[PDB]
Amino acid sequence: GTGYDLSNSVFSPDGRNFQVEYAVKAVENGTTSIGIKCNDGVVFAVEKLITSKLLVPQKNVKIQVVDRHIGCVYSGLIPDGRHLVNRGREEAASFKKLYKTPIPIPAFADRLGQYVQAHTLYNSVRPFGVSTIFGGVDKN
Amino acid sequence: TQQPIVTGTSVISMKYDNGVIIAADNLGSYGSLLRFNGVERLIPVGDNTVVGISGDISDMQHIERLLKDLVTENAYDNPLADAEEALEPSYIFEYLATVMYQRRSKMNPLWNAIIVAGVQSNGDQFLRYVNLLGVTYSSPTLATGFGAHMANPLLRKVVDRESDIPKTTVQVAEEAIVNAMRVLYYRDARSSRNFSLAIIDKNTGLTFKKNLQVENMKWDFAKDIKGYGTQKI
């Protein structure tokens, strides 16, 4: 039979989660964005389509800061990216609150990872319609 | 409901013609034991605000961490963070005041007296007080705990009403403050000689002075005082 693709946490007979695969289509459809690691830091850039002269330039900022030392950029469904960055902010506050030091980047990565994965565990949520490129400088 | 354990004594402050001055000594007392000597109780937020805190030090450290967090948060999705949408002293004050009042209302206070000193974006001087009850007030001079008894009367001789503010120079003001710290060191048993002072000036910006010392103390007359009435030698 079929219908494997109608519901989020469902494994298809070949072991795939189709809804996640469809989320990836939403990403591919989005604006292009990149990150480049350099010898002492990271650089993030994004393409911002101008739909009309009417958009105030410089104004609809897309890159987001998490804590003081982390930058995030994403392609796809933008509101999804925001939601993910909100969570990243709570998640980093929590870490700083308890451990005093600002969150290490690999630690931070995993926090976002676990939250995103969480949204492929149940059919009462949809997966995230973004890929996120993010990074920073930490203790090492 | 709690009781303060490690405490900081007075925070004193006044406004002059261009800005505001605020000072506090570097002591953390533990009852009558003068326990800790390296304690900074002036908290600068941005470059236009200094929050000076007395009372319970563990609570001060909590408020410290709240203020770091406010900076982080205001910077989020804000491309005018370091310009028109930076934190004003009035924002920082009204936030703290909110916290302090909600905390007393839950019968679990932050055991502090706080003075927020700064310069607004239109150049106006900001000086307001908030304590553990959530009580707030402004005046051309403001001091906490012991300082309200001994600094205010000295500082009020210099600025005594609003109209005295344009007449007062940073030299005259800082002198008045420095003198008040010496008086407090003479008569407050919970005070230290070492202190920090900060000026927030609409032209010069923020000057933060650390490791000051009460200088120029009169003790000589002590040699002529003997006994407690009839004793001659």
Side-chain angles (χ1 to χ4, degrees):
Chain A
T2 48
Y4 291 103
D5 72 325
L6 303 159
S7 181
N8 191 7
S9 44
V10 178
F11 279 105
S12 64
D14 40 327
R16 293 150 57 183
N17 177 0
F18 274 78
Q19 275 285 133
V20 166
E21 289 181 29
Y22 301 172
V24 160
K25 296 280 164 170
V27 183
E28 284 166 0
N29 189 268
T31 271
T32 155
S33 67
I34 56 153
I36 309 162
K37 187 187 179 179
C38 69
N39 49 216
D40 81 327
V42 287
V43 176
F44 305 99
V46 68
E47 168 194 57
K48 298 171 54 179
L49 302 186
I50 297 155
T51 319
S52 90
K53 298 281 177 181
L54 292 169
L55 274 83
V56 195
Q58 307 310 295
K59 265 282 199 276
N60 298 289
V61 186
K62 279 179 71 184
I63 306 199
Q64 286 177 291
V65 69
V66 169
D67 196 74
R68 255 126 106 162
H69 64 312
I70 293 161
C72 306
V73 76
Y74 44 76
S75 306
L77 294 183
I78 301 303
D80 284 20
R82 273 193 64 80
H83 180 105
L84 185 52
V85 169
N86 290 153
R87 177 64 188 207
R89 288 157 175 182
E90 300 174 288
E91 205 94 57
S94 159
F95 188 105
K96 181 187 256 158
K97 189 178 196 293
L98 176 61
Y99 307 126
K100 190 100 171 51
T101 173
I103 190 167
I105 317 299
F108 176 78
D110 193 64
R111 295 283 183 100
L112 290 181
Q114 298 284 2
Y115 185 74
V116 166
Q117 193 268 170
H119 286 75
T120 78
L121 286 175
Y122 320 99
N123 61 203
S124 49
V125 285
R126 150 170 91 58
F128 280 99
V130 285
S131 297
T132 317
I133 293 165
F134 62 90
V137 171
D138 59 33
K139 146 212 290 213
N140 51 11
Chain B
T1 289
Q2 37 173 110
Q3 39 143 16
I5 304 286
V6 184
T7 56
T9 191
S10 301
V11 170
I12 61 164
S13 80
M14 60 187 300
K15 51 177 91 171
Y16 58 90
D17 58 14
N18 296 149
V20 299
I21 307 177
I22 190 172
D25 67 20
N26 298 329
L27 182 69
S29 280
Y30 183 84
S32 50
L33 169 57
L34 308 169
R35 204 170 167 177
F36 302 113
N37 282 107
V39 179
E40 180 54 67
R41 317 190 280 110
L42 303 174
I43 288 95
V45 186
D47 51 24
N48 62 158
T49 307
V50 165
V51 178
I53 305 159
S54 60
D56 180 273
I57 292 331
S58 78
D59 288 336
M60 184 203 84
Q61 293 181 2
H62 179 66
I63 285 147
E64 204 166 326
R65 180 190 70 83
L66 288 174
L67 287 171
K68 281 150 197 216
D69 203 67
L70 246 194
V71 163
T72 300
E73 203 77 42
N74 170 76
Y76 285 158
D77 308 334
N78 192 15
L80 309 179
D82 60 352
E84 299 102 318
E85 294 287 353
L87 292 167
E88 289 279 80
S90 47
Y91 313 156
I92 288 161
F93 179 88
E94 198 71 12
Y95 171 73
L96 292 190
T98 294
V99 178
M100 297 295 282
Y101 183 70
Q102 283 175 192
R103 292 294 299 264
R104 92 101 218 190
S105 300
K106 287 207 183 68
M107 294 298 284
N108 176 212
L110 295 168
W111 205 282
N112 290 109
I114 304 163
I115 290 159
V116 167
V119 180
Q120 292 273 108
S121 63
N122 68 358
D124 280 2
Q125 313 94 313
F126 188 96
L127 205 63
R128 214 162 160 80
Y129 169 105
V130 73
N131 67 15
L132 76 166
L133 295 171
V135 177
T136 70
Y137 40 82
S138 270
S139 177
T141 67
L142 288 177
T144 74
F146 222 87
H149 291 106
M150 294 202 87
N152 272 345
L154 294 172
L155 303 180
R156 281 153 182 201
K157 261 152 93 77
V158 181
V159 281
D160 199 39
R161 69 270 296 325
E162 205 72 25
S163 71
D164 286 331
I165 300 161
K167 296 156 209 213
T168 323
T169 68
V170 214
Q171 286 64 216
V172 164
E174 185 173 14
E175 194 177 302
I177 299 290
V178 170
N179 177 252
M181 302 299 299
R182 174 181 40 246
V183 171
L184 307 178
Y185 185 68
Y186 278 152
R187 300 322 265 231
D188 180 358
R190 290 312 166 264
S191 65
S192 166
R193 191 173 185 158
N194 298 113
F195 73 107
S196 309
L197 180 142
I199 306 164
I200 299 106
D201 185 284
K202 76 181 178 169
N203 305 304
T204 53
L206 192 167
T207 312
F208 195 94
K209 301 182 206 189
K210 294 181 160 286
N211 307 98
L212 276 46
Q213 277 210 204
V214 164
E215 292 313 346
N216 303 304
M217 288 184 305
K218 288 188 182 55
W219 286 105
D220 184 63
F221 72 92
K223 72 168 186 315
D224 313 306
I225 275 155
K226 55 249 172 213
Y228 47 77
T230 61
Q231 197 166 285
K232 276 159 193 189
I233 53 194

